């Protein structure tokens, strides 16, 4: 009867183990009165949480407890977790063990505090902590490989070997989906229509998710774009006006492979992946190449895996096979991997029990987990 909770930097997916999908998915967000003192539509509340926060945003300032996959506000994190258990999931944390997720290179302090909150505040029988990337690998039915997890805030390359991520070869790239909505915002604004209001930035993100794609050959798709209109598409904004973009469709996610488009001196995701592989043991590289799993919403662009295969095939040795796995359910692959794991009977021996914590304190999480 285990619970699984994937805390995203901007979206929280929580449900029961062994389920196909999470029963609860709401915005990891805590909103409070905008300002100008007592300009209230709320009666007797100091804040809203979850869905109620996304609505009522008119006079709310919306703040995320998780930034770049790391908890930066533990009070609003405990709020989101209470809201999860009691309001959205409708369960007693005392009668279920909880599997929680963390980001790569999470600090140890936040891991301890995560565990301490689970055992003290919510008084859970047992609990566990797993890396999101690793749970995506498990969800792809794999135990070894390399995962490119690009979500809302940050992008991580995580080599994994037989169930353990490799911290020395993890690579971090500070470029994710929100940087791509911003980029698209700028290229669309510049040429005609001003996207300032955040309510309209949600329209820009919807354009991104509905019309953008990744070109296999960028400079060819630019030349196609300039020679013909074969790549044009139109979009219907709420006021009935329509806009036609063609060349922005693949220029927006091109930033993933050429961060310089965003004035970034970093290297794209293809180099970041390959470079991570080169920091791994020379024995396992061949199984990393053949098992490069994609996860995260920002990896949903069409043609992303095709260009991964191409660019990495250009970097690697002519000998190796490069297979890029792009599951379905990539937006929920982290949760589903957690549901599998928590369901496995072989995993029940691995939980952390509340007695163990009462004896050793939250520090016990560094061993018995990683």
């Amino acid at each position: 009867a285990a619970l699984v909770v994937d805390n995203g930097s901007g979206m929280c997916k929580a449900g029961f183990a062994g389920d196909d999908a999470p029963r609860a998915v709401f915005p990891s967000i805590v909103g409070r009165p905008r300002h100008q003192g007592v300009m209230v539509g709320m009666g007797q509340k100091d804040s809203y949480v979850g869905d109620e926060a996304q609505s009522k945003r008119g006079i709310l300032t919306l703040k995320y407890p998780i930034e770049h996959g790391i908890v930066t506000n533990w009070d609003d994190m405990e709020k989101i977790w209470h809201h999860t258990f009691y309001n959205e999931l409708r369960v007693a944390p005392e009668e279920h063990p909880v599997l929680l997720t963390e980001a790569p290179l999470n600090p140890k302090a936040n891991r301890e505090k995560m565990t301490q909150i689970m055992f003290e505040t919510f008084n859970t029988p047992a609990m566990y902590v797993a890396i999101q990337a690793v749970l995506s690998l498990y969800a792809s039915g794999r135990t070894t490989g390399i995962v490119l997890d690009s979500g809302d805030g940050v992008s991580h390359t995580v080599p994994i070997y037989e169930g353990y991520a490799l911290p020395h070869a993890i690579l971090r790239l500070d470029l994710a989906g929100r940087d791509l909505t911003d980029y698209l915002m700028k290229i669309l604004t510049e040429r005609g229509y001003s996207f300032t209001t955040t309510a309209e930035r949600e329209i820009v993100r919807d354009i991104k998710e509905k019309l953008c794609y990744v070109a296999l050959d960028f400079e060819q798709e630019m030349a196609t774009a300039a020679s013909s209109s074969s790549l044009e598409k139109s979009y219907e904004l709420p006021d009935g006006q329509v806009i036609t973009i063609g060349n922005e469709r693949f220029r927006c996610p091109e930033a993933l492979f050429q961060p310089s488009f965003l004035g970034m001196e970093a290297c794209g995701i293809h180099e970041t992946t390959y470079n991570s592989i080169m920091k791994c043991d020379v024995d396992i590289r061949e199984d990393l190449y053949a098992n490069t799993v994609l996860s995260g919403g920002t990896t949903m662009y069409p043609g992303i895996a095709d260009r991964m295969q191409k660019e990495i095939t250009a970097l690697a040795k002519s000998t190796m096979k490069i297979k890029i796995i792009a599951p379905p359910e990539r937006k929920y692959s982290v949760w589903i991997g957690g549901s599998i794991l928590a369901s496995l009977s072989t995993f029940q021996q691995m939980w952390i029990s509340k007695q163990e914590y009462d004896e050793s304190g939250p520090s016990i999480v560094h061993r018995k987990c990683f």
Binding site: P33, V38, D46, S47, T72, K113, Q116, I340, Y357, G361
Partner: protein, 193 residues
């Protein structure tokens, strides 16, 4: 959605059946009224939660609350969110908590303006000497103060883990697990939307 006059009257009356004092989203905006709420609660012992969220409260109110938190020894939770308090009022409160054993939760979110780097590192400095506070409702902009703080609150709660500990008192597994994770797939899961 609460009357100020009669409720206040219950505070200074120390009504047995007033464990909550909720002034959230009230237009009174009287600094004096809130400051006498502080004096009212100063000798009170039933109240365990005094909240005033989004009342346009200023620094003086934060001062009254600050000195008072040493007198009152029964309020476990204080809330001053969404108000207009500066590093002065907040740092005053923190200096009060320098020696205050009862208070366990304090929240000041969505304030008028940022506190400031030096104000935040000051907060962490003062609260380094506190052991009873378990939850602090604030988002540090600087990573240093933030990690220091989470460490503090972790050890304060640990003290609960330890005291409770003595009170109440007196690999092949991983490898087979992996073998099991490879043999799994989504077809084993309960289909649901």
């Amino acid at each position: 959605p609460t009357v100020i006059e009669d409720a206040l009257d219950k505070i200074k009356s120390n009504d047995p059946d007033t464990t909550e004092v909720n002034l959230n989203n009230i237009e009174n905006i009287t600094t004096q009224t809130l400051t006498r709420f502080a004096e009212a609660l100063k000798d009170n012992t039933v109240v365990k939660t005094f909240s005033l969220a989004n009342t346009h409260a200023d620094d003086s109110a934060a001062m009254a609350i600050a000195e008072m938190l040493k007198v009152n020894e029964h309020i476990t939770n204080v809330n001053v969110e969404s108000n207009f308090i500066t590093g002065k009022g907040i740092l005053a409160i923190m200096r009060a908590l320098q020696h205050n054993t009862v208070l366990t939760e304090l929240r000041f979110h969505n304030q008028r303006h940022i506190m400031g780097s030096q104000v935040e590192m000051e907060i962490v400095k003062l609260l380094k000497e506190n052991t009873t506070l378990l939850r602090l409702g604030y988002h540090f902009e600087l990573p240093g103060p933030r990690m220091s703080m989470t460490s503090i609150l972790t050890r304060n709660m640990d003290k609960q883990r330890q005291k409770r500990l003595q009170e109440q008192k007196q690999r092949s597994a991983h490898e087979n697990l992996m073998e099991a994770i490879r043999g799994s797939s989504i077809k084993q899961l309960k289909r649901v939307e």
